[PDB]
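Retro notes
What went well: the complex prediction finally ran end to end.
Inputs used:
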Amino acid sequence: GSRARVYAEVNSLRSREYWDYEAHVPSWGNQDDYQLVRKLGRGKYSEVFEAINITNNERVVVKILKPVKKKKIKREVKILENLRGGTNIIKLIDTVKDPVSKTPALVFEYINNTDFKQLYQILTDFDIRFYMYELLKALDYCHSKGIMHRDVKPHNVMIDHQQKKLRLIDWGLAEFYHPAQEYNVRVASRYFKGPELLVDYQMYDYSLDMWSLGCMLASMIFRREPFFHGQDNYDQLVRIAKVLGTEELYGYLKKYHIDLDPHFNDILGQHSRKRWENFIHSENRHLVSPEALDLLDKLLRYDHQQRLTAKEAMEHPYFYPVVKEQS
Amino acid sequence: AXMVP
Ligand SMILES: O=C(O)c1cccnc1
Ligand SMILES: [Cl-]
């Protein structure tokens, strides 16, 4: 067994209606308030468009929910409604349905984001601190509301670098945390999957998102995106073990009594834990500080229970320059 | 497409 160290009982202390998303009855707006303008590049199955809100002349984003089973539509809508107003959480404006096909669509605020592949190569030390701090605010918020995002990755963190705005998007994999519940491990992008997912440990919690955030921090400070670049899910764990070492991996499995897929016996090998300083080189030196490495070391831990919480991370000295300027 | 086309 395992339990979240914080926010464990949030859903137990709310009404059944809060987390019982299968019972949620979405409230459909007028699809005719919105006029599609262009399809956005969001992924192989996505149908996401920029659109005009004809009622206020506002630019919006429309996400047509097609590939999904109905229970997951309710889950995403209910989660976005529960997080409405939250800090750095993408704002849901409306939920509409085609009258004829019945295909639902979610309408979101438009963020003028800079593609992460171009943005990450121009970030400075202070920019990374700032945007990581802003992302932590979103994660602390959703975790405090009893929700795990489960798909934190660069593509899901929209940054408008001119207005210094950040939004955590794509809540389609997010779920409510309940103590002792077993969750589907087929979540997250391969490169951002926590070790718990890779070894099929289902009793995970909000700390999954803190692994993913650590992966993003490492990628930014070391100019190595993604940080752990595996070729499949098995190799992904190897890539992690080549950095974190195998002894702590086997220690984690032993502690939680984790059933290890036997094909890992052949590929994991024996690896020492590498010191984080060893990933500094001439083209990332201006981004790396002892405070950054101290934080990263407390996020990228096998043992999900020993990772910092979002709030603990926000209190780390790495973020002092940001907190001071927010005063 | 919502509002025509
Ligand atoms: O999937 C989402 O939440 C999304 C996608 C693009 C833009 N805004 C939100
Ligand atoms: Cl790698």
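What we learned: The beta strands of chain A are 34-39, 48-53, 58-64, 92-97, 104-109, 147-148, 157-160, 165-168, 175-176.
What to try next: split runs per interface for comparison.
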